[PDB]
């Protein structure tokens, strides 16, 4: 109904290893979106599994957290925006990825 | 919001005028690297460069 | 390390269980003590949930340890019950042996001793409760207020604030109160306690509870009418105050 | 939305969103048939008004268009607006929105154009009734919320504006133009405007300034006075009223020619005079620069009150603040006439009290020296001037001077200037005269001359209240016929009194400045002082100077130096004015010579100032022309030419600086960029032109008050190290000086690198050294600014010697001038009746946030700092007073003005 | 930490700087230790018993 | 209307004017010279051949020759030719090479990399106080450390003590520590880098620590500068399990980051802003000081703070006629600044929806309950009562 | 963490064990006491069910402690068993000693003390039981309390503990009144229970009930656990069946 460019982007982002794994190419998403503005983004991190996962600060939790975190910095940005909007879909907010909200 | 909304519309027009300077400014340049007294060495350099021992 | 029992001393030389007990104090209700020169006023904040909780059958935060000693408390509500009971059986045991009204000084040392006992041994945690214990001595009219902490250190303080957001009450209290000239009349003493609790309650005079302990074993708990009467006078003078700065600034 | 008939009152509104029945059919038939229905229609008006009010909330374009479609036709088709006379006239209430629904809600290009014109005519006719005003008011203050009116209501107002503006652009005026169709004046629309103004001033801001500037008359502005002065405190505080008034005047600055712009600000001053704050008054009276207005605000406090009271103390403070001292002279002697106390009053107006306060500041700021140790040759000369440049303002460095060893090793022109630098150690000080006297009575005539200059500098801070005037010392020297002596004497008198055009000062200088037949280089100083004297207040454009400039030209042309200085003195003389200066351009131009053409472009800048954007395009056509003519062909003269070229360049810069200051603060950024494109254009095209424009640039910045100070001086400096004339560096450093130790940290390293590194001529080295020392005053002792300080739009007087000297290739003679550099700023302090020397607290904020004022009044939040701190330069200028919490009230609003704070404690 | 011992003297100096005083009292060093230590405690081991004692 | 017009007048005329003059002058640069500056241009164009490859200067060799490393696998032996002298070149500098016979043209790359463009900001924040709602003491501290030494060294002279080398910002989530950093960046008039701390981390052997090193390299040259590195809990010491690529990477980046920041004589005038959100994963060798020389705790607003944040935000929202500000802030307890920012946007939204052209009391109170749901803890009176 | 003993505290002065023991009570079935000024009704929901579970001859969350005070049970049944027996002994011990029955306020206080003791002392579990107390004693008339597993008590005019605590409490206070009636109170428990429970049948087999009244006879106090066939009868009248 909106008729804008979506940038779905399925359930993980570690599904791309053609340039290697997104560790700092997560940020590349925002650049490609900004050009093709409006930037309505959709993201699935459903997070129904793992009743404990919020106390972590992390082992190899850290890789996927570094991906999660860099999203937030880019979003809030510094400080120009082109009406960037992030729709999230998720199972609970009690069972959630630490510092996503 | 007409009384002040009018003046806002003019402000976006200003943004484009400053952008047009960025383009313009680049249109003529003058540059040079090295120093002026090393002009004689260029002359030499064409004879070595052209030549084959390197 | 080193907070996993009471029996580790730690190289920073703190017994953590005591340090963490202090942060539990915050959970309870503001309590304020102010001595005059013929009274001690002991007042506390009363939490109000809903209208389905009573305030009739539901316990006040001021508890009589006898008929001349009183106590208000801050900490876990569960903890405080046994602390008070044990203190009370001592207060009676004192007349059983001597036949004297309990000394204010003797009592506070007993309650700090109980917390100290718990704190020394590792088979228990201490009561996570600080109290203020007000009262008057068996026959002297010299007003006494003492404080205990979970550690089982007691002090005498002329005025002291404990409970939720204690520090912000402390600074106001420090300023206004004098040990050069404490309140001569119970009425100004009561209102100073009201002034202290005004800050932290915000709305309500049904969240301020006043009881007074005076010499000759008089303890009276004051009515909702009288407290509402005190808060309105404070509210009128405060309204007036705002106007005067506004005038004075224009005037100069 | 759908029709749902007359079941209830709710569905009646729904019924009429698609098709009215109480506004369309019935009414139409009645009007087009019976005329006893004229009576039914009158009662039904009320009903119809209500139905609009309910459906205002509906916004959709379609259900207002179509609904009221046939009513729109009816104006001319069936009613023809005169079938029953009075009755359509009063029935135009509802028909007027119908028209607006096609203008604005629906956009059909053909009708939206045409019906603008209709709307105007009917706005007028219906404003006789004064009911068109009420129609406007119900949308201006609102009843209902919809997007629609937020766009619509602007149009109604726009009709009025349309016509009134056009009467300036087209002369025919009135309703003869079919663009509006409505009479410009008359007692029918005039009453409409006054009433419209009232409602829009309360709720909005948009149209109140537009009406004034389109009438163009000072008369519109004087109606504004009446209404606003009622509003001054009961409707909203003093403060708010003030911010509007000056927003009107400061925003429309560029588009007001000279006579119009003085004439508008008169009225803003008076508005200020009526209202409670006289503090707002004094500041505008100064803007104008008229004598007449200064005196009314000073009088208003001194004369009524018999007693000393607050009233005398306040008058003195207020005049004391301008350090042009133009106000100082005028106000003095009233104090004498009243006679309560002579002693306190007279001293306090005088800049004598400003010395005392300086000692308090100095005490924090202490003494750190950093002077050159270098001795022998031209390096001796360099160091000895450098000592004064570091200890500018009241400093005590007595002992060093008393070591006459280094003093005496100066030679030539260096000797005069050496004594002259000494005078600036005791700049703004009573004491110091002593040092000067020793030399004045011994050795060559050279030391004697140099003594008089220094006297000039010392006397800057004590020359009123008839307490050692410079006039007293220096008269004796004028009489003495030796030229060096006499020239030096009048240079210092002019500096000291500054703007003060007192009878003794002025009149000593009046027969004189009138001998140029004898050929003497140093007689530049004949006119040069008098020009300086003149600035700071309205000019006569004195007949002494104008006659002598012409005479010199007749006599000589040999001394190129003499005539270049002369040309500038004339332009500096006309500063303080602009209206009267449009005349003298012609007068000068009557006599025509290519040598005279150099004088004109200079003067053009002062006449056009404050509306200039014609002036700008002109000073650029000039630049191009030498090259351009040559361009066409390709596909005694010496002196005249050189004057020609050089003048233009000075003029372009002066023009810019003065315009940007007064105009939009935004525009300050743009004008610097234009300069850089002017220089780039010159570096390639003319070799000779490039030399002049380098020097001009430093004073471009210092005058204009650029916001940026970090990037631009530094960057520019580097290119210009290669480029000849090291005098460049001195012109940059006067801008860079800033809040010492912010900008100037970068500066000492950057200026120092080129100097220290390169030594290939001691001549070259000398300019560089002086520039460096100037920049820094130790631990923020003082700041120099071209500006008044008291206004930030304002321009100084004392700083005009600095501005003069960047027009010529460097000269040892010029060095002597350069010592003089005056333009102090006082550090504010809270005063008391025992004259407390300490500030309590202040807020400072780098950047103002308020966008209602382009000046930006201080925020009330700020960042907090301590007692007795200098009033910071840029990135600290907004200053708010913190004292209110200790129950203290400023009497003297300070926004970061030069002025000293003053407080009343409860 | 010896490093944080260096930070005392710098911080003490900061208090003299905002006060506009041209020297550093005994008092303001007292504050300078207090800030560094009290901040550091936030990370590791909190609280004292000499908050009432 | 008059206030906007006054600013708009000055900034449009000059900027439009600066534009038009650049157009005329640009042509006019060229005509003066035609053989006086032209000569250097002709000689470069011929030697370069136009195509050119990069090399990195390995070392110099005494006899006006040099040896270079190409981006292709072989090295080549070059001769030093042309205008650019060998006192303008040292080892460790990039050089251009000629196509046909590889020859030292001169340098013009000046060790450029695409990561310098990323470091380099061009976007300018709002941002100054009076858009920062309270935290008076917190505003003050970051200004004295980061803004102040640069603007006024005078105080630092007089006392004679070195200026703060950094500051670290930490506290609760969403507190708006980010405004304050932005505010410092706008006001200074200094070269502002940054970067995100998640950008130094990759997976490729040894590239990560060299990206860390690069930031300082660009700052030290264009000093004084300020560097803002966000989120340092993306570059802490934390576990890394087993059978991971990233276990080395996290270790090396952090190590290089540490040495450069301390210096061995240091940059000496570049201050740093670190911000972070987890201090229980921070390494211990980055918050001990000489690195950072304040450490400051941010906490969620209280009554006075809330009223200020609120105060600025409501003045930028039309018609708060029947809206009392005080009555809302009183009831609100323990919220972030994020939550009050959100409540203004939500409350305006409810005012739109009401079919109302203005905000009300009831629009604000409804929005307020909603955002209290979001940030709530109740185990205080759960445990107690 | 600071789970590991029950005689520890945490950096925030919480104790994970007190919180965890508290959440145990929202795992077991709804229990509701509503005080009215004409009786107190106790109503409770079962947490077990099936066609071969016997629950039509038995109560297991309504215990008369003594003869004028009774409790509804919410929490673990094992935890519940011991403390119910202790509580009944002390209530009745008073009976012996003073030859008049225990007051409501003292008996709740006693049992809260015992609760608290398991957290305070030793290396034992806290007790995860929330008992709703409904009594009569002639000092304060009708008294409603509930005790937390933390081991403290507060008086009430209506309360709900056990599963869906938050939902039940909201439901009760919408339709409650201070005047009230005992008959309106029964109907109110039945009203709340329909919504709160995850079983849409909500028939007799799931429901316990006892009403304690002093309006039952005059000068006398009657605790009546209703029998299963009365519980059915009242479900028609409120119309749930
Ligand atoms: N004091 C304030 N004034 C104005 N807006 C505020 C204020 N505090 C919070 N905000 C608003 O709420 C936002 C919350 O801060 P933000 O989400 O950027 O987190 P942070 O804790 O600074 O993050 P990180 O650890 O990622 O650097 C701010 O950016 C601003 O939009
Ligand atoms: Mg942030």
Curated annotation (Swiss-Prot), chain A:
Transmembrane segments: none annotated. One of its GO terms (molecular function) is proteasome-activating activity. GO terms for biological process: chromatin remodeling; nonfunctional rRNA decay; nucleotide-excision repair; positive regulation of RNA polymerase II transcription preinitiation complex assembly; positive regulation of transcription elongation by RNA polymerase II; proteasome regulatory particle assembly; proteasome-mediated ubiquitin-dependent protein catabolic process. The keyword Cytoplasm applies. GO terms for cellular component: nucleus; proteasome complex; proteasome regulatory particle, base subcomplex; proteasome storage granule. Signal peptide: none annotated. It comes from the Eukaryota. May form a homodimer or a heterodimer with a related family member. Interacts with OLA1, TMA17, and UBR1. The 26S proteasome is involved in the ATP-dependent degradation of ubiquitinated proteins. The regulatory (or ATPase) complex confers ATP dependency and substrate specificity to the 26S complex. Present with 4700 molecules/cell in log phase SD medium. This is 26S proteasome regulatory subunit 8 homolog. The chain holds residues 205 to 305 of 405 of the full protein.
UniProtKB/Swiss-Prot annotation, chain B:
It comes from the Eukaryota. It is found in: Cytoplasm; Nucleus. The N-terminus is blocked. Present with 105 molecules/cell in log phase SD medium. Interacts with UBR1 and CIC1. Belongs to the AAA ATPase family. The 26S proteasome is involved in the ATP-dependent degradation of ubiquitinated proteins. The regulatory (or ATPase) complex confers ATP dependency and substrate specificity to the 26S complex. This is 26S proteasome regulatory subunit 7 homolog. It comes from Saccharomyces cerevisiae (strain ATCC 204508 / S288c).
Swiss-Prot record, chain D:
The modification Phosphothreonine is found at residue 24. The keyword Iron-sulfur does not apply. GO terms for biological process: proteasome-mediated ubiquitin-dependent protein catabolic process; regulation of protein catabolic process; ubiquitin-dependent protein catabolic process. Keywords: Phosphoprotein, Proteasome, Repeat. Residues 1-11, 24-34 have a biased composition (Basic and acidic residues). The modification Phosphoserine is found at residues 16, 19, 178, 187. One of its GO terms (molecular function) is enzyme regulator activity. The keyword Phosphoprotein applies. One of its GO terms (cellular component) is cytoplasm. InterPro entries: 26S_Psome_Rpn1, ARM-like, ARM-type_fold, Proteasome/cyclosome_rpt, RPN1_C, RPN1_N. Residues 179-191 have a biased composition (Low complexity). Gene3D superfamilies: Leucine-rich Repeat Variant. Present with 306000 molecules/cell in log phase SD medium. Belongs to the proteasome subunit S2 family. This is 26S proteasome regulatory subunit RPN1. It comes from Saccharomyces cerevisiae (strain ATCC 204508 / S288c).
Curated annotation (Swiss-Prot), chain G:
CDD domains: proteasome_alpha_type_4. It comes from the Eukaryota. Keywords: Cytoplasm, Isopeptide bond, Nucleus, Proteasome, Ubl conjugation. It is found in: Cytoplasm; Nucleus. GO terms for biological process: proteasomal ubiquitin-independent protein catabolic process; proteasome core complex assembly; proteasome-mediated ubiquitin-dependent protein catabolic process. The proteasome degrades poly-ubiquitinated proteins in the cytoplasm and in the nucleus. It is essential for the regulated turnover of proteins and for the removal of misfolded proteins. The proteasome is a multicatalytic proteinase complex that is characterized by its ability to cleave peptides with Arg, Phe, Tyr, Leu, and Glu adjacent to the leaving group at neutral or slightly basic pH. It has an ATP-dependent proteolytic activity. The 26S proteasome consists of a 20S proteasome core and two 19S regulatory subunits. The 20S proteasome core is composed of 28 subunits that are arranged in four stacked rings, resulting in a barrel-shaped structure. The two end rings are each formed by seven alpha subunits, and the two central rings are each formed by seven beta subunits. The catalytic chamber with the active sites is on the inside of the barrel. This is Proteasome subunit alpha type-3.
